[PDB]
Each structure stands twice: as structure tokens, then as C-alpha cells.
């Protein structure tokens, strides 16, 4: 990571809150003053514990190892001065789940699939770098003004509480977190994207979600969802982890679909939950 001097960072506005309250949008002066880039700034408030510092700076240490279009860029950190700060590229549309919920129905199928391809490319890179994310969910994807989606929030990532309904069965039960359990999570992210940010499994409790999954039941198809896309998410949810696609398979399949876009016009049947009978 690069150590940034506080004189090079301005905080302009509050853009969201998180674990280490809070997150600002600001500007970062770079290249000895010739360049100026918009940034997000996460701060660690005074009184933090040793664990909190290890987790806070560890996230930046992980992010700083990566250089990929679909992974949030770390500009640098302020650790020599307080409060400590992690400074990342600014993503104008924030978290993907909240963004889609505010854009319900407004994107095309091709656009949604392109977002998933970007996420998959970032995850393929991450897994190939020998990391497991463990917390892959649309809330942890960020979106810029150009609709590019980037993996973020590496607080739980590791080199080789987590929300149950994004987590593969073997990671829930045995704490066996691998790229294959991340593939399960990616399948849930596919469902989140295609539904414009619906809550996986709706009103089911965590125990009810585990009951359904272990009985072989899976999330139903989203409305207006290409058959190939639903088939792919179903494969990500294979009980046996060795049967799930690898991230390289996911990227390749999504690429083939995007480049032959009539392939996305064959839709999976949306199951009529509600019978409305008219003439
Ligand atoms: N680079 C960014 N660009 C724009 N907004 C960001 C950026 N980073 C974080 N945020 C905002 O800050 C929110 C908090 O997410 P993060 O701080 O990345 O995760 P976190 O610190 O683990 O907090 P939680 O508890 O997961 S929301 C994000 O959901 C966005 O609302």
C-alpha cells in the first residue's frame, strides 16, 4: 500500500455508513500535485482496539495486492496520522443491491448480464490470486457512473458472522470456505441482480433457508430471466462443491451469451405464484 499524507486528502460529503463509521466522498491529490481524483474515504475512529486495527489495515493490505478492472482500486492509506483512513476509487452509484432497488426494471437483460460478467471477472481474478472472499453479495459490489461493477469489502477475505443465505452449505456447517463456496455466493448474486435486489428467500428465516436448501429446493427463477442465466445460477448451487462451475467457466459462459445475444431471448418460465383470472 501507499502511505498518503493528510494534506493531500479533502473530505467533501457523507456517502454512507459502515462497520468503521463512517464513509466520505472526497478528493485525493496525486502525482505530486498534478492529478486530482475523486475517492471514497473510510475512517477508523479513535479508541479502536488492536483487533479493529488489524482488520481495518488488513482489508487495505488485501486490496493493495490487486490490479483488476472489476476490483475496487486502493489509492492508499493514512496510518501514520489519526484518524486512520482507507482511500479507494469513488464509485458514484454506491452499493449494487441498493442501486438496483432504486432502478427497478430500468435496465435491459443484456445490461444485467454484463454486470454479472464484470463481477465474475473480478471474482475469477480474486480466486486465482488465492483469496476467498467469504462475503460475496450484491451489497459488497460497487457501481460507478458507467455501470461498471467492482468487487469490494474485503474485511472478511482471507488467503487460502457471515450471512447464511449467501453461504454454501459446507461453509455454513464445516467453515470450509473456498472459491467453490464463493461460487455458491455468486449464484445468489446472480439472483439478486436479475431481481433488482430482492431479498434471497424473502421472508424465510435462516433456519428455514437451511431447511429448504438441504432438502434440495432452490431459489425460483426471477421474472424476465434468460433460461441460460437461471441454469447457470442453479449450477452454482450444486450441493457437491466439486460439481459447481469454476469462476473461469462462469466468465466463459457469460461471455459466449453476451456475444450471441439472441441466446438470452429464451426465457425460463416465471412460476405463476399468483393466479389472476380475466376474460
Ligand atoms: N469506494 C466507494 N465508493 C462509493 N461508496 C463507497 C465506497 N466504498 C464504500 N462505500 C459506501 O460505504 C458503504 C459501506 O460499505 P463498506 O464500508 O465498504 O463495508 P463495511 O465497512 O464492512 O460496512 P458494512 O457494515 O459492510 S455496510 C458502502 O455500502 C457504500 O455505501
Curated annotation (Swiss-Prot):
Going by the entry's taxonomy, the superkingdom of the source organism is recorded as: Eukaryota
Name its cellular compartments: Cell membrane; Cell projection, Ruffle membrane; Cell projection, Lamellipodium membrane; Cell junction, Focal adhesion
What is the tissue localization of expression for this protein? Answer: Expressed in brain and glioma tissue and glioma cell lines (at protein level). Expressed most highly in tissues that contain a high proportion of epithelial cells, e.g. skin, intestine, lung, and ovary.
Detail which positions bind ATP. 15-23, 42
Positions where Phosphothreonine occurs in the chain: 43
Any coiled-coil ranges, and where?
none
Effect recorded for residue 42 to M: Loss of kinase activity
Q: Which residues form the active site?
A: 135 (proton acceptor)
Q: Where is the Protein kinase domain?
A: 9-258
The record's account of how the chain is modified after translation: Autophosphorylates. Phosphorylated on tyrosine upon binding and activation by EFNA1. These phosphorylated residues are critical for recruitment of VAV2 and VAV3 and PI3-kinase p85 subunit which transduce downstream signaling to activate RAC1 GTPase and cell migration. Ubiquitinated by CHIP/STUB1. Ubiquitination is regulated by the HSP90 chaperone and regulates the receptor stability and activity through proteasomal degradation. ANKS1A prevents ubiquitination and degradation.
Residues that bear Phosphoserine? 252, 275
Query: Which ranges sit in the Cytoplasmic compartment?
Result: 1-279
Residue ranges of the region described as Mediates interaction with ARHGEF16 and ELMO2: 2-279
Residues with PTM Phosphotyrosine: 24, 131
| Induction notes from the record | Up-regulated by UV irradiation via a TP53-independent, MAPK-dependent mechanism.
| Subunit structure and binding partners | Homodimer. Interacts with SLA. Interacts (phosphorylated form) with VAV2, VAV3 and PI3-kinase p85 subunit (PIK3R1, PIK3R2 or PIK3R3); critical for the EFNA1-induced activation of RAC1 which stimulates cell migration. Interacts with INPPL1; regulates activated EPHA2 endocytosis and degradation. Interacts (inactivated form) with PTK2/FAK1 and interacts (EFNA1 ligand-activated form) with PTPN11; regulates integrin-mediated adhesion. Interacts with ARHGEF16, DOCK4 and ELMO2; mediates ligand-independent activation of RAC1 which stimulates cell migration. (Microbial infection) Interacts with human herpes virus 8/HHV-8 glycoprotein L/gL and glycoprotein H/gH heterodimer; this interaction triggers EPHA2 phosphorylation and endocytosis, allowing virus entry.
* Pathological association: Cataract 6, multiple types: An opacification of the crystalline lens of the eye that frequently results in visual impairment or blindness. Opacities vary in morphology, are often confined to a portion of the lens, and may be static or progressive. CTRCT6 includes posterior polar and age-related cortical cataracts, among others. Posterior polar cataract is a subcapsular opacity, usually disk-shaped, located at the back of the lens. Age-related cortical cataract is a developmental punctate opacity restricted to the cortex. Overexpressed in several cancer types and promotes malignancy.
Q: Which family does it belong to?
A: Belongs to the protein kinase superfamily. Tyr protein kinase family. Ephrin receptor subfamily.
Q: What does this protein do?
A: Receptor tyrosine kinase which binds promiscuously membrane-bound ephrin-A family ligands residing on adjacent cells, leading to contact-dependent bidirectional signaling into neighboring cells. The signaling pathway downstream of the receptor is referred to as forward signaling while the signaling pathway downstream of the ephrin ligand is referred to as reverse signaling. Activated by the ligand ephrin-A1/EFNA1 regulates migration, integrin-mediated adhesion, proliferation and differentiation of cells.
Protein's name according to its UniProt entry: Ephrin type-A receptor 2
What is the source species? Homo sapiens (Human)
Amino acid at each position: 500500500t501507499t502511505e498518503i499524507h493528510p494534506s493531500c486528502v479533502t473530505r467533501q460529503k457523507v456517502i454512507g455508513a459502515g462497520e468503521f463509521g463512517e464513509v466520505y466522498k472526497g478528493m485525493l491529490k496525486t502525482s505530486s500535485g498534478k492529478k486530482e481524483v475523486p475517492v471514497a474515504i473510510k475512517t477508523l475512529k479513535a479508541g479502536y482496539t488492536e483487533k479493529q486495527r488489524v482488520d481495518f489495515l488488513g482489508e487495505a493490505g488485501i486490496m493493495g495486492q490487486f490490479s483488476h478492472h472489476n476490483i475496487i482500486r486502493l489509492e492508499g492509506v493514512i496510518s501514520k496520522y489519526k484518524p486512520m483512513m482507507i482511500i479507494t476509487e469513488y464509485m458514484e452509484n454506491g452499493a449494487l443491491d441498493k442501486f438496483l432497488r432504486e432502478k427497478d426494471g430500468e435496465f435491459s437483460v443484456l445490461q444485467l448480464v454484463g454486470m454479472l460478467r464484470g463481477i465474475a471477472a473480478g471474482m475469477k481474478y480474486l480466486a486465482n490470486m488465492n483469496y476467498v472472499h467469504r462475503d460475496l453479495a450484491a451489497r459488497n459490489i460497487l457501481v460507478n457512473s458507467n455501470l461498471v461493477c467492482k468487487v469490494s469489502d474485503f474485511g472478511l477475505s482471507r488467503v487460502l458472522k457471515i450471512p447464511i443465505r449467501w453461504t454454501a452449505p459446507e461453509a455454513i456447517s464445516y467453515r470450509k470456505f473456498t472459491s467453490a463456496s464463493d461460487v455458491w455466493s455468486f449464484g445468489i448474486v446472480m439472483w439478486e441482480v436479475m431481481t433488482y435486489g430482492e431479498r434471497p428467500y424473502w421472508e424465510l428465516s435462516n433456519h428455514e433457508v437451511m431447511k429448504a436448501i438441504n432438502d434440495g429446493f432452490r431459489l425460483p427463477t426471477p421474472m424476465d430471466c434468460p433460461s441460460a442465466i437461471y441454469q447457470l445460477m442453479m449450477q452454482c448451487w450444486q450441493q457437491e462443491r466439486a460439481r459447481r462451475p469454476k469462476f473461469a467457466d462462469i466468465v466463459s459462459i457469460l461471455d459466449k451469451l453476451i456475444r450471441a445475444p439472441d441466446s438470452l431471448k429464451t426465457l425460463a418460465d416465471f412460476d405463476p405464484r399468483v393466479s389472476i383470472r380475466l376474460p
